[PDB]
Amino acid sequence: MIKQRTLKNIIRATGVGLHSGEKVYLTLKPAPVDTGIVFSRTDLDPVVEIPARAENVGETTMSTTLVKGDVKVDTVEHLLSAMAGLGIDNAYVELSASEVPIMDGSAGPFVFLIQSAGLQEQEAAKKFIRIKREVSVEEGDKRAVFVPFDGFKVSFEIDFDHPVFRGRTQQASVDFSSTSFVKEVSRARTFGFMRDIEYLRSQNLALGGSVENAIVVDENRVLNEDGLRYEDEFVKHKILDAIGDLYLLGNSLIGEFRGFKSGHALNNQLLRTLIADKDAWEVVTFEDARTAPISY
Ligand SMILES: Nc1ccc(C#CC#Cc2ccc(C(=O)N[C@H](C(=O)NO)[C@@H](O)c3ccc(O)cc3)cc2)cc1
Numbered sequence: 433m434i435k436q437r438t439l440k441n442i443i444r445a446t447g448v449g450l451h452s453g454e455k456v457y458l459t460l461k462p463a464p465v466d467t468g469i470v471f472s473r474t475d476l477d478p479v480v481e482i483p484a485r486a487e488n489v490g491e492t493t494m495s496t497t498l499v500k501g502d503v504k505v506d507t508v509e510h511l512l513s514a515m516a517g518l519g520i521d522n523a524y525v526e527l528s529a530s531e532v533p534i535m536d537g538s539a540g541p542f543v544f545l546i547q548s549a550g551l552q553e554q555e556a557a558k559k560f561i562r563i564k565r566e567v568s569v570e571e572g573d574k575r576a577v578f579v580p581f582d583g584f585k586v587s588f589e590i591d592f593d594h595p596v597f598r599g600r601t602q603q604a605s606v607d608f609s610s611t612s613f614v615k616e617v618s619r620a621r622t623f624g625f626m627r628d629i630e631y632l633r634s635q636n637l638a639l640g641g642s643v644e645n646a647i648v649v650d651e652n653r654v655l656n657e658d659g660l661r662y663e664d665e666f667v668k669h670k671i672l673d674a675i676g677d678l679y680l681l682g683n684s685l686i687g688e689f690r691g692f693k694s695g696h697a698l699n700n701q702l703l704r705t706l707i708a709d710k711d712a713w714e715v716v717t718f719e720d721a722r723t724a725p726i727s728y
Pocket residue numbers: 450494495496509510622623624625629632638641642643646648669670673695
């Protein structure tokens with residue numbers, strides 16, 4: 433059977449929150465079968481735990497934020513993308529502050545941490561959510577869709593008209609049958625438009641942002657001197673973001689996500705909308721890994 437996966441060892445890193453600029457200690461720990469990913473604010477007394485599930489996502493302008501009462505864990509999407517990409521079912525994530533460290537702006541550092549902790553197979557069948565019927569949500573010209581697919585595929589299109597984006601692909605469709613999440617998706621850095629980052633900074637936000645953790649573009653050019661890690665790094669980061677947000681379903685997906693100018697809010701709306709309709713999905717396991725449309 434395809435087994436559930438956790439970490440072999442506890443592993444740690446430090447960084448700063450992108451939004452808050454606050455130094456934060458991060459700890460990844462093994463967890464028992466059927467735990468899922470659970471965040472813990474260990475700085476608080478008592479310690480507050482928030483399961484990484486769609487229903488616990490709050491309403492914020494930027495990034496995916498988990499909430500329980502007045503307690504938050506901000507910017508969970510890149511770490512969760514790495515967890516999803518490596519097929520980690522169960523883990524505890526301890527944080528000393530209200531935001532996951534931004535690291536280099538990609539999922540790469542979290543992939544590195546997870547790999548370094550080691551991968552531990554557990555004695556229980558891994559559960560998958562299979563999309564049975566197409567479900568969609570929209571807001572203006574933004575659209576997010578789950579489509580049935582015998583495998584795992586993430587497609588995304590952005591639609592920027594600014595000169596800096598002219599001629600760029602702005603679209604990608606990744607079938608993970610033949611694409612490596614680690615090598616071809618995980619290192620895509622977050623990005624922002626200079627005018628928008630200026631606005632955030634004027635409000636004392638984006639305090640942790642720097643040339644070391646984000647690609648900055650103005651209307652006409654990429655400002656980062658070194659260029660891009662992938663030729664289509666921008667849309668690849670949107671795909672990274674979607675994979676992280678989708679992991680709030682609590683299980684790996686058998687299906688396709690299609691995003692059109694979508695973001696964290698719409699991604700979460702899609703999850704809640706899918707979850708509510710039991711005719712549109714089912715939970716499956718694989719007693720024979722060879723008969724599975726995916727592999728970790
Ligand atoms: N010297 C110096 C140099 C640089 C800086 C800086 C900075 C910064 C920044 C920043 C802020 C917010 C985002 C952001 O939310 N990006 C989206 C994202 O990846 N979410 O996970 C992403 O999905 C997104 C969402 C909307 C959009 O229009 C573009 C990208 C990213 C980056 C300060 C000083």
